[PDB]
């Protein structure tokens, strides 16, 4: 239809806030799945270890 962003909010800071310890979080829409990017120092899924 048309635009109309109604209340924008990501699960990265709603429910999965306690997931991405140290890293950039990006909720995937096309896949409806949340992920946690780990920097060079960090690794894994949550990216808690560096």
Swiss-Prot record:
Domain named EGF-like: residues: 8-48
Function noted in UniProt: Ligand of the EGF receptor/EGFR. Autocrine growth factor as well as a mitogen for a broad range of target cells including astrocytes, Schwann cells and fibroblasts.
Summary of subunit composition and partner proteins: The immature precursor interacts with CNIH.
Induction (record text): By phorbol 12-myristate 13-acetate (PMA).
Provenance organism: Homo sapiens (Human)
Gene name of this polypeptide: AREG
Protein name per UniProt: Amphiregulin
Cystines in this chain: 12-25, 20-36, 38-47
Protein localization: Membrane
UniProt miscellaneous comment: AR is a protein containing cysteines in disulfide linkage(s) that are essential for its biological activity. AR may contain oligosaccharides and/or lipid moieties that are not obligatory for the biological activity.
Protein family per UniProt: Belongs to the amphiregulin family.
Residues of the full protein shown: 142 to 184 of 252
